[PDB]
Design a protein around this ligand. Structure first.
Ligand SMILES: Nc1ncnc2c1ncn2[C@@H]1O[C@H](COP(=O)(O)OP(=O)(O)O)[C@@H](O)[C@H]1O
Ligand SMILES: Nc1ncnc2c1ncn2[C@@H]1O[C@H](COP(=O)(O)OP(=O)(O)O)[C@@H](O)[C@H]1O
Ligand SMILES: Nc1ncnc2c1ncn2[C@@H]1O[C@H](COP(=O)(O)OP(=O)(O)O)[C@@H](O)[C@H]1O
Ligand SMILES: Nc1ncnc2c1ncn2[C@@H]1O[C@H](COP(=O)(O)OP(=O)(O)O)[C@@H](O)[C@H]1O
Ligand SMILES: [Mg+2]
Ligand SMILES: [Mg+2]
Ligand SMILES: [Mg+2]
Ligand SMILES: [Mg+2]
Lengths: 120, 319, 228, 320, 228, 318, 158
DNA sequence: GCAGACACTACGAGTACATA
DNA sequence: TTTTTATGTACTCGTAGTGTCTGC
């Protein structure tokens, strides 16, 4: 995490690139201590692909036993051709709550559980 | 003159204080305890200090003994949920025919997964606090949920002011004297006890123990003084040879630590971080972390460790 | 279709082999293991009407465990399975038949290469001894004319050297020598009497357990030996 | 004379495990505080730690309990869980030894991190049973022992002797290994072998003994066996000249001579160049040889990567 | 070599003291807890003909509760423990005796410093009240000239001040005053009339329970105070 | 020389049963034959980064030559509770048959089982009387140092030059026997020689290439061409840098990315004669740098292309 | 021309069932036919860094032409507890009709599978008599070298 | 002639740890 | 002014379901 937070700010990236290389097997206390004298200036700043698509992407991936990349492409071509609406119905039975809650717990996996319900 | 538990043999607890006035605390805290005992009833008190052996469990027991309280001592680790609802409630709701204040000491309460039992204790303090009070002794204060510190009087140990530290160490130098008087230890040099108290200060349990380990001769001559002042080593020879750029000793110390490479590289980073300049802190962790990254890829691990020594000598600007 | 106590208990058994089951019109239910090691079949007394595939058979029987015995299991006009109670009513979503790996191929067992029968309390004692003795593999061979089942600790015992249990099940007649090793894990029959049928020729084989109601066909471990 | 054979053990390094505290090989002050504990008849809480393995910890623990004649409880720290601490250990500490021998618990290999809840409970455990019972802890990572628990014990750092103690410890370990060979019938043809075995495996005395067994396969510690300990695989000679005159024609055809002996050759090369080059060209040697050694393995052509070292050496070191 | 159900009942009691046991040939058996906390010795009705060490005595008897009581036990050529049944056979592995902490010789209990005599139903009521009043440690001492037992709740009592029980036992004809504390967790004896022998010298001490077939040496507590 | 039958996959079908049948460096076998000579097996860690060296086979052969009560365990399944359970359960069992028990923990170099390793610390010293543990690892630094202390660390795949010659000769006679038992005719015998050298320390892939290269059913000179492959000369490569071109050397890398070690092992040798003297030190610095990182390099072909670009710049040539 | 008529995506529907039906370059088509002719399959890592070459189809084609009892699983869903449970219960048991048992691991070069990869070395050796493993790799370096020791590295040639 | 209640197990949760 | 990603392992705790034993 601590490296991936400075991964957004490119000015901190030289030290993050080093700890990526050689920081493996380096002490946690040493990791913070290296990044102490390594990051330039401070004044901590801001922060660091949607649900209803990411259920289909991960549902097609498990059905055809393909990877994210392949699953992502599957949908994009199916949105263009032979009814993605049909294959949505083909996969309404394997939308278990263990499947659902695994992606976005919060409160969406209940508005998503019975979201793909109405697909018949 | 010192309370002894003549069934202890272990020094570090044979002479554990009984009352507040026997304890060695900062004057304000020591006064705040004597006043808490004077007022009759003990409040909810959290005694904490990250540095161990400062007086927590002693003061917790000393408050119960001064007040002459019906004390229920419990190991905070066995203070699970079925315990707070069980023997804790049975005691809190017992009849105090004795009139003495019921007080429950939860020793070493700060723990990882005792969260549900911890919040139960807070809600327990809205029901049975009418009857009993609770003394908590913890090291990490954060291990304690915020509601408890909000209610309890949090007295932080082991964080004394300069003037408070000076008087406390002087009191402790007199304690170890009265220990050596009562145990049979000859104090040939008084600077031993002074250096004993000073070397490992806030931990009063540890400094009494160190006196036991240095009492192996039965006398505290200046040789024992030379022991206590001898700052030990760990890897003091490598740090020394790195500051001196002594290529000969780096060449001969690399076969010394190539056996336990992974420990030594971790111990070396820990030691140089204090001894080296800040602009060198960058090159330090880069040289070491890279050398450890290729550890095992390097065919000769001993020469690879000498490589680390040569690399540091050339690149470290020393303090 | 109405689901009685003996049939739901069978489905509770078939759930252990496959997380779901596919069942078509009739009184014949069948499921196979996902990897293809344990095949179970059962002709039952309760008759089912339509064809249905249940992906979560375990959760299906749990939801059914609140409805009275009058439980009316019907198809929904859209397709799902509604459960009508004396008062309440539940809706369960059905799954596609290709989601549940179905046996689909109930080819009959061949000729029994060897035949014996294991009692109900004999299977009981085997499963209860293994629970206490940690027996993970059993081998069915012949000893002094009578055939026996030997249990081992495949992990604690590489090539099945030291026996930990042996149960005799009657005598063998023909002059054959063999040793069929079955994995205790992929052995999921319910308690009862089973006429043990053993078939094996060349390098292929299987073990069939003929219960008074259902049949269980498990696979034999590759280490098994025989002279058939 | 005093040397203990366990006989019931076949694996050498466990048969010749020291039985009493005098048989242990320890720094003088550390042996002085252990004899002091025995002469006091009572044992405190102690942590025997060392980053190096087999320094004496588990043996000194058992040896200290023997000389005290202690009702001791040897416990594998990894198997000592909180409930085991709540249970048989608390039921042990609260006993009253039927023969009065002071009770001790030996938590062997306690530096584990998963058993932190046991240590948190052990903070007030030792304090509640300081009479009757005491705990000896054997750890390898002291920082695995939580600083409160460290406070309750006497922390004795093994495998880290002062130089004057290191000399007397190797000297004892040599005389020890000499007596071990007598018991085992190993012929000490060259005493410098025993010294090399002790010096190379210090302070892991268990690995020292294990090395003796590894190399006593022939039953004789001859001069060829010393050349195996120091792995003195000869001199280099031909490479040194071919660098001193920068002979690349020979150097590139001489690299295959050490492709299968890289780790030794790299060590021997730096060992000889150290005395055969100018003072500040020594630091340039360890800079390019240490790098060349560090990148071996991920090197594609291990032969070519050795020739890379040769051409880089001949072009940057000036021979004194 | 079959084991009667009272002998095994005594064995399942010994398993509470030590998870294993080392039993040699003969009619005499014994065990001691690893933490030197309790020691039990007993001669029994069956006869052991061979030395054997059992690493898991609890699981041994739990498995021995699965064959018929007529089961013939023996030392198999398969050098372990053979449990011959009517049809089945259990080969329980004999354990290396070095892995079983057992008393190498029976503890000869010294001359008793004080002698009393608990009754079986008095002991029974003592266990029932302890499970009801959370009584964890008890003390046997003198009260108005009689030997009594007093239980506490060391959790809530800590100092052991508030008495929670008083089984007035025998009378004391001596002049000594003792306060022997026993931990209830170390009361591993099976119910039955016992002659209670007490001994304590200086900072040492132990209690012995002489039975009609089984004897038990349970350890006293660190805080046991006596004037012997 | 001992067929396993049962299996169909050659390398597993011909795994040596005895340690004498094992082919491994001279001193290792003598330490192995001495261990079996003693009759009792210590704690051993057989390790080598190079796979298929015999570490597992030696372990199973060590227990065989001694008649040990061997319990084989996939080290990835050797969890702490598995050590607490079946391992103790088996080490504490009596050996009335006089057999010594040996726990063989195959592939026990994993990092997540450190807690299981740290339990074995005192386990091994506790049962050291009749139980011993053979550890087989690839990454030996994944074994905690307190266990390497307790074991005899025997490093495979690190022979002397003399051992390499004899071990190849021992693998030649073994391989031609594999072909006799398997029915593979050997025409040009030098094929078997190149099959052993191409995958030397990995004897598993050595047989794996034999099976793979017997697709014709015979080992003719055409099979030897298939084993030493490309070769020729680095001609077109050499005039690529000689012309300091654009796309020609860029698209030339994949033909030489496969045999990278040999390619660089002949590129620097051919170029040594025709690239001046002051750039003979610059070319070896550039080529050596690009060579030592060929492993951390993910795209071997791009690594070679990166070597070509910097060569085209800093080379004086002629 | 093989069609799985129950399929809705043309990629999965028109997947060649036979190694002949695969549109593959020479030497490869010669190699795979030689492998299927043996009737028994050794551990195969066929790999091609170019997508859509036929890694997955060939892996399934070899299982069909040899009439294998194939269990096809994606590497990402092939974790270590998946290997301990199902994959072991499969390769340990012998199929009722004999015939080769195969375990295809598609895209096993995924990074998180390093430790489950380390389980297979010894797994593949323990059950090499009854079952072989075909690994589909995109990046070959993602396969730990001890697995390449046990497998045949087929690289799709230019 | 079974219920009760302790005794035992399994599992969800939360935790801490080491890797890439 | 921000708040999360994968796999595997080991341990503790809480509770809840299941198992073995007992009453005036
Ligand atoms: N303030 C103090 N004054 C005197 N002795 C102390 C003090 N603090 C600790 N000690 C010594 O340490 C032991 C008690 O440690 P304690 O403070 O109770 O543990 P902790 O501080 O870790 O809760 C006693 O035996 C006592 O001799
Ligand atoms: N200080 C020592 N003195 C004598 N022998 C030792 C010493 N340390 C280790 N050894 C040798 O190693 C073995 C002891 O190892 P041990 O101390 O138990 O390991 P650890 O210290 O890692 O727990 C003994 O058999 C002994 O031969
Ligand atoms: N030293 C060797 N001698 C003979 N055959 C060997 C040797 N090393 C490997 N092999 C071959 O490879 C296989 C053994 O590989 P193995 O030792 O199990 O790999 P690892 O060492 O990675 O565990 C055997 O089937 C054998 O045919
Ligand atoms: N060599 C080939 N011959 C025939 N079809 C192919 C071939 N390669 C790919 N395909 C087609 O591409 C689809 C997916 O191929 P796949 O095996 O997934 O390749 P990869 O796994 O390399 O992406 C298949 O449905 C098939 O129809
Ligand atoms: Mg305290
Ligand atoms: Mg140890
Ligand atoms: Mg192997
Ligand atoms: Mg694919």
């Amino acid at each position: 995490m601590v490296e991936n937070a400075l991964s957004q700010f490119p000015e901190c990236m030289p030290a993050v690139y080093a700890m990526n290389l050689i920081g493996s097997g380096l002490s946690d206390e040493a990791h913070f201590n290296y990044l102490m004298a390594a990051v330039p200036r401070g004044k901590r700043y801001g922060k660091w692909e949607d649900s209803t698509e990411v259920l289909i992407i991960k549902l097609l991936a498990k059905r055809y036993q393909v990877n994210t990349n392949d699953a992502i492409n599957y949908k994009s071509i199916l949105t263009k051709n032979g009814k993605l609406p049909l294959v949505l119905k083909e996969l309404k039975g394997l939308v278990t709550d263990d499947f659902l809650k695994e992606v976005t717990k919060n409160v969406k996996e209940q508005k998503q559980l019975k979201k793909l319900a109405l697909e018949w | 003159m010192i309370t002894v538990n003549e069934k202890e043999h272990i020094l570090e607890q044979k002479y554990r204080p009984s009352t507040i006035d026997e304890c060695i605390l900062p004057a304000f805290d020591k006064e705040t305890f004597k006043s808490i005992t004077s007022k009759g009833k003990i409040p909810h008190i959290i005694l904490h200090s990250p540095s161990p052996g400062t007086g927590k469990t002693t003061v917790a027991k000393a408050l119960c003994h001064d007040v002459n309280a019906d004390m229920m001592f419990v190991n905070g680790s066995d203070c699970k949920i079925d315990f707070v609802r069980g023997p804790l409630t049975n005691f809190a709701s017992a009849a105090s025919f004795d009139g003495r204040q019921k007080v429950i000491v939860i020793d070493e309460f700060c723990r990882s997964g005792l969260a549900e039992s911890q919040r139960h204790l807070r809600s327990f303090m809205e029901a049975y606090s009418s009857n009993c009070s609770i003394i908590i002794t913890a090291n990490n204060i954060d291990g304690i949920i915020k509601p408890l510190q909000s209610r309890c009087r949090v007295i932080t140990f082991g964080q004394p002011t300069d003037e408070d530290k000076i008087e406390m160490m002087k009191q402790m130098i007199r304690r170890l004297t009265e220990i050596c008087k009562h145990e049979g230890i000859a104090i040939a040099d008084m600077k031993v006890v002074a250096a004993l108290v000073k070397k490992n200060f806030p931990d009063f349990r540890k400094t009494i123990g160190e006196l036991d380990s240095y009492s192996s001769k039965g006398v505290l001559d200046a040789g024992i003084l030379s022991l206590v002042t001898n700052d030990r080593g760990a890897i003091d020879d490598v740090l020394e040879s790195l500051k001196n750029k002594d290529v000969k000793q780096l060449r001969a110390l690399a076969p010394k630590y190539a056996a336990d490479y992974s420990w030594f590289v971790g111990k070396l980073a820990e030691e140089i971080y204090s001894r080296v300049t800040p602009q060198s802190i960058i090159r330090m962790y880069e040289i070491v972390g890279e050398n450890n990254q290729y550890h095992g890829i390097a065919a000769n691990t001993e020469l690879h460790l000498a490589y680390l020594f040569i690399q540091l000598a050339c690149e470290m600007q020393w303090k | 279709m109405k689901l009685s106590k003996d049939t739901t208990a069978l489905l509770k058994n078939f759930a252990t082999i496959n997380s779901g089951i596919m069942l078509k019109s009739g009184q014949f239910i069948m499921t196979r293991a996902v990897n293809g090691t344990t095949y179970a079949e059962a002709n039952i007394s309760d008759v089912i009407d339509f064809d249905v595939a249940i992906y979560d058979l375990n959760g299906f029987l749990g939801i059914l465990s609140l409805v009275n015995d009058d439980a009316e299991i019907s198809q929904s006009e859209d397709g799902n399975i509604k459960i009508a109670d004396a008062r309440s009513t539940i809706f369960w979503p059905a799954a596609d038949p290709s989601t549940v790996v179905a046996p689909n191929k109930p080819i009959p067992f061949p000729v029994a290469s060897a035949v014996t029968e294991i009692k109900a309390e004999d299977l009981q004692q085997l499963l209860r001894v293994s629970r206490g003795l940690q027996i993970d593999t059993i081998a069915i061979t012949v000893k002094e004319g009578k055939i026996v089942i030997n249990g081992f600790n495949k992990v604690e015992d590489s090539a099945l050297t030291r026996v930990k249990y042996s149960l005799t099940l009657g005598d063998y007649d023909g002059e054959n020598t063999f040793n069929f090793i079955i994995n205790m894990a992929n052995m999921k029959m319910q308690p009862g009497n089973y006429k043990l049928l053993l078939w094996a020729k060349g390098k292929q084989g299987a073990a069939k357990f003929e219960g008074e109601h259902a049949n269980y066909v498990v696979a034999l471990e590759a280490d098994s030996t025989h002279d058939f």
